[PDB]
């Protein structure tokens, strides 16, 4: 149990750090994905000038 | 795996518990006989005394 939870205590860590990666890749594409909705709308402003 | 050695030192506990008890139980029977005998040396050194 005690070299049992070693393993466990280890694996909740990497978990756990992976969980924050996986966190901040989440964030990227948010913020990425909004940045694809900023810039969508210059392709309509681009035209927008013709009717 | 944790679980399974749970069961194991749960069971060696209880089983351990009932060999302890159990040797606890032939123990105080043991030291009443002892009381028995230290009993019986009086009346011997007694009983030799007299004798004497």
């Known amino acids: 149990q005690s070299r049992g939870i070693d393993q466990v205590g280890l694996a909740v860590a990497e978990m756990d750090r992976v969980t924050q990666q996986n966190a901040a890749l989440v964030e990227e594409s948010a913020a990425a994905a909004a940045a694809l909705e900023e810039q969508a709308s210059r392709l309509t402003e681009a035209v927008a000038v013709f009717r | ?52």
Do not use: C, F, W, Y
């Open chain 2, 1 to 52: 795996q944790l679980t399974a050695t749970v069961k194991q030192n749960a069971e060696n506990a209880r089983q351990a518990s009932h060999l302890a008890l159990s040797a606890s139980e032939t123990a105080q029977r043991g030291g009443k006989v002892v009381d028995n005998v230290v009993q019986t040396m009086r009346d011997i050194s007694t009983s030799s005394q007299k004798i004497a």
